Amino acid sequence: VPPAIVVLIGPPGYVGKQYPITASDIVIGRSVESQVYIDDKSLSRSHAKFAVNGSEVSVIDLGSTNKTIVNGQVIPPLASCLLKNNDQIKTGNVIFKFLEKGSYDRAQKDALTGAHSKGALLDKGPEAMKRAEVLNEPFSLVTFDIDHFKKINDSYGHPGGDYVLKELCRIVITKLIRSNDFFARYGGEEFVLLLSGSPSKTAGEVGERIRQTIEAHDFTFEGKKIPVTISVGVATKLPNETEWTQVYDRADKALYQSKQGGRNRTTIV
Amino acid sequence: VPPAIVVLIGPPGYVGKQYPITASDIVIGRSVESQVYIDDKSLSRSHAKFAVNGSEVSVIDLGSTNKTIVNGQVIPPLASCLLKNNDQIKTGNVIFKFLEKGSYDRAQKDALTGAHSKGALLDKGPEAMKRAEVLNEPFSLVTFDIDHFKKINDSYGHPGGDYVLKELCRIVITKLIRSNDFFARYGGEEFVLLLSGSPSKTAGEVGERIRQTIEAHDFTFEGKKIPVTISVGVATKLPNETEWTQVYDRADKALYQSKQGGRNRTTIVA
Ligand SMILES: Nc1nc2c(ncn2[C@@H]2O[C@@H]3COP(=O)(O)O[C@H]4[C@@H](O)[C@H](n5cnc6c(=O)[nH]c(N)nc65)O[C@@H]4COP(=O)(O)O[C@H]3[C@H]2O)c(=O)[nH]1
Ligand SMILES: Nc1nc2c(ncn2[C@@H]2O[C@@H]3COP(=O)(O)O[C@H]4[C@@H](O)[C@H](n5cnc6c(=O)[nH]c(N)nc65)O[C@@H]4COP(=O)(O)O[C@H]3[C@H]2O)c(=O)[nH]1
Ligand SMILES: [Cl-]
Ligand SMILES: [Cl-]
Ligand SMILES: [Cl-]
Ligand SMILES: [Cl-]
Ligand SMILES: [Cl-]
Numbered sequence: 001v002p003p004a005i006v007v008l009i010g011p012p013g014y015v016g017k018q019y020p021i022t023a024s025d026i027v028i029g030r031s032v033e034s035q036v037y038i039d040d041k042s043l044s045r046s047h048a049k050f051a052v053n054g055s056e057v058s059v060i061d062l063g064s065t066n067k068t069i070v071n072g073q074v075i076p077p078l079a080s081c082l083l084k085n086n087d088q089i090k091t092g093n094v095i096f097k098f099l100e101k102g103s104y105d106r107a108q109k110d111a112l113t114g115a116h117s118k119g120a121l122l123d124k125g126p127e128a129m130k131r132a133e134v135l136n137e138p139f140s141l142v143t144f145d146i147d148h149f150k151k152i153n154d155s156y157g158h159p160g161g162d163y164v165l166k167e168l169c170r171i172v173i174t175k176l177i178r179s180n181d182f183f184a185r186y187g188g189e190e191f192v193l194l195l196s197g198s199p200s201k202t203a204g205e206v207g208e209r210i211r212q213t214i215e216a217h218d219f220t221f222e223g224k225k226i227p228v229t230i231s232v233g234v235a236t237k238l239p240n241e242t243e244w245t246q247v248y249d250r251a252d253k254a255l256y257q258s259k260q261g262g263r264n265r266t267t268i269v
Numbered sequence: 270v271p272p273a274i275v276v277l278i279g280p281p282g283y284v285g286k287q288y289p290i291t292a293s294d295i296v297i298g299r300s301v302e303s304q305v306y307i308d309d310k311s312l313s314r315s316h317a318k319f320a321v322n323g324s325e326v327s328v329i330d331l332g333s334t335n336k337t338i339v340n341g342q343v344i345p346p347l348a349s350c351l352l353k354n355n356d357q358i359k360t361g362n363v364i365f366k367f368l369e370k371g372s373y374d375r376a377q378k379d380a381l382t383g384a385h386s387k388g389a390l391l392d393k394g395p396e397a398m399k400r401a402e403v404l405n406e407p408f409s410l411v412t413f414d415i416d417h418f419k420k421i422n423d424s425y426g427h428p429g430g431d432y433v434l435k436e437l438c439r440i441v442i443t444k445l446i447r448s449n450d451f452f453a454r455y456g457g458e459e460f461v462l463l464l465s466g467s468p469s470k471t472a473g474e475v476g477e478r479i480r481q482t483i484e485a486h487d488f489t490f491e492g493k494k495i496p497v498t499i500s501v502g503v504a505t506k507l508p509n510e511t512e513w514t515q516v517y518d519r520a521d522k523a524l525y526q527s528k529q530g531g532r533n534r535t536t537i538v539a
Contacts, residue, residue: 046347104405
C-alpha cells in the first residue's frame with residue numbers, strides 16, 4: 001500500500017483527499033496537468049515534485065513563489081528533502097501530511113471534515129489558532145448571548161430556556177452560516193462562532209445578520225411566543241495571542257459593551 | 270543588478286528584449302500570465318521556468334512539446350540545468366542567451382466592467398472541469414445578457430449602455446457572488462458565472478438572486494432612470510461532459526428560452 005499525502009488545509013472539497021505517491025515526478029501544482037492538482041492561486045502552476053528511490057520519498061521545490069516548507073523549514077529550489085511519516089508539507093496555503101502508508105458520498109464527505117459544526121469547541125479553538133498562525137490568515141470570533149435569559153427561565157421554566165438555546169443553535173447551524181463555519185454553545189447562555197479567514201469588518205457583518213434574523217424569528221414554546229434577542233461581540237486574533245480564549249475574552253468585552261448600550265446590538269473591537 | 274535572459278531570435282519585436290531573472294517562479298511560455306510571455310505557437314503555454322538559489326540560476330523544462338534545449342542538449346521534463354554566462358536556451362523556435370549580469374498588466378480584466386476577460390474564461394474553464402472530475406463535485410454555469418441593450422444605447426447613448434454594463438457588473442461582483450466565484454464577460458453583453466461545487470438548485474438560486482437584484486436596482490444615468498433587466502440561463506455539468514463549453518452551450522440554450530419566454534427571467538436547463 002503506497003505512501004501518500006493527505007490534504008490537511010486546502011480549498012473547499014479538498015480536505016481529507018489522499019494522493020498516492022507511487023512514482024517520481026508527481027507534481028503538486030495548480031496546472032491541470034499536475035498529478036496533485038489543487039485549484040488554489042497560492043500554488044505555482046508547477047510548485048513541487050516528488051522523487052521516489054525505493055522506500056525513500058523526497059520532495060523537491062520547483063522554484064515556487066510561495067515556497068515549499070517541510071515542518072516549518074523552507075526547502076530551497078531544487079534541493080531534495082527526505083520525508084518521514086507525519087511530516088507536514090506546506091505549499092502556499094495548502095498543507096499536506098505525508099503518510100508512509102496511505103489509508104465518498106455526501107454524508108461521508110461531511111463526516112470527513114465534521115461539517116455543520118460536528119466537532120467540539122475545545123478542539124476547534126486550538127485548530128483555528130494554529131491555522132491562523134501557519135497561514136498568516138485572519139481569524140475572527142463572534143460571541144452571542146441571549147438577552148434577559150434569566151427572565152425567559154423565570155417566565156417559561158428552565159425547559160423554556162433550554163428550548164430557546166437548542167432552537168437558536170439549530171437555526172444558526174442549519175440555516176444561517178456556512179457549512180465549514182464552526183458554531184457552538186459556550187457556558188450557560190453564550191454561543192461562539194469561529195470565522196477562520198474573516199477580518200473584523202466581515203465578522204461584524206455576519207454577527208449583525210445573525211442578530212437581525214434571530215430578532216425576527218418566532219420562538220414558540222408549547223404554544224407561547226417567547227421574545228428573543230441577542231447581543232453580539234466580535235474580535236479578531238492579534239499576533240501576540242496564543243490561546244483562543246484570549247480572542248474570546250476581547251469579543252466578550254465587546255459584547256458586554258453592546259449589552260450596557262441597550263442590548264440587541266453588535267459591537268466590534 | 271540581476272541576471273537576465275535576452276532574446277536572440279524570436280517573433281518580431283522581441284529580439285534584444287531582456288527579462289530579468291530576479292526571483293524564482295519566472296515562467297517562459299505563450300500563456301499571458303507568463304513572466305516571460307512570448308507570443309509564439311512553438312512554445313507551450315508553460316514551457317520552462319527558472320529556479321534561483323542565491324547566485325545559482327537553473328532552468329527547468331515543464332514537459333514542453335518542442336523541448337527546452339541548453340547549448341544543444343535537451344533537458345528532460347522536470348529536470349533542471351544550472352546556467353552559466355552566455356548559455357543559449359532554445360524553447361521551440363525562440364532562442365535566448367543567459368547573462369550572469371543583464372543591463373505589463375496580467376490581471377486579464379475587462380476595461381469597462383472589471384469582470385474577467387473572455388481569455389481568462391478560456392483558461393479557467395478547463396480548470397473548473399478538472400476540479401469537478403478530481404473531486405467528483407458538481408460544477409454549474411450561469412449565463413446572462415442584458416435585455417433590449419440596443420434600445421438602451423439608442424435611447425441614452427453608448428455611454429449610457431456603458432454605464433449600465435459597468436454598474437451591473439459592480440453590483441454582481443461586489444454584492445451578489447463570492448469573491449472566488451469566477452465572473453467573466455464572454456463577448457458582447459453576455460456574461461458567464463462559474464460555480465464550483467454547486468448543484469443545479471444552488472445555481473438557479475444564484476441566477477435568480479442576480480436577476481431579481483438587477484430588476485430592482487435603480488440604474489440612474491445623469492439623473493434619469495434606465496429600466497434594466499437580464500435574461501438568465503443555467504446548466505450543471507453532466508457526468509459524460511469533458512469540455513466546459515458543453516455546459517456553456519446548454520446554459521446558452523436555456524438563456525435563449527428565457528429570451529423567447531418574455532425576457533427578464535431565469536431558465537434552468539431541463
Ligand atoms: N447573506 C449571506 N448569507 C450567507 C452567506 N454565506 C452563507 N450564508 C448563509 O448561510 C447558508 C448556508 O451557506 P452554505 O453552507 O455555504 O451553503 C450555500 C452554498 O453552498 C451555496 N451558495 C449560495 N450562494 C452562493 C454564492 O454566491 N456562491 C457560491 N460559490 N455558493 C453559493 O448554496 C448553499 C445554500 O445557500 P443559501 O440557501 O443562501 O444558505 C446560506 C445562506 O443562508 C453570505 O455570504 N451572505
Ligand atoms: N465564513 C462566512 N462568511 C460570511 C457569511 N456570511 C457573509 N459572509 C462574509 O461576509 C461577506 C459579505 O457578505 P454579504 O454582504 O452577505 O454579500 C455576499 C452575498 O450577498 C452573496 N452571497 C455569497 N454567498 C452567499 C450565500 O451562501 N447565500 C446568500 N443568500 N448570499 C451569498 O455574495 C456577497 C459576497 O460574498 P463573499 O464574497 O463571500 O463576502 C462575504 C463573506 O466574506 C457566513 O455565513 N460565513
Ligand atoms: Cl507559476
Ligand atoms: Cl510554474
Ligand atoms: Cl488554543
Ligand atoms: Cl501547451
Ligand atoms: Cl434582447
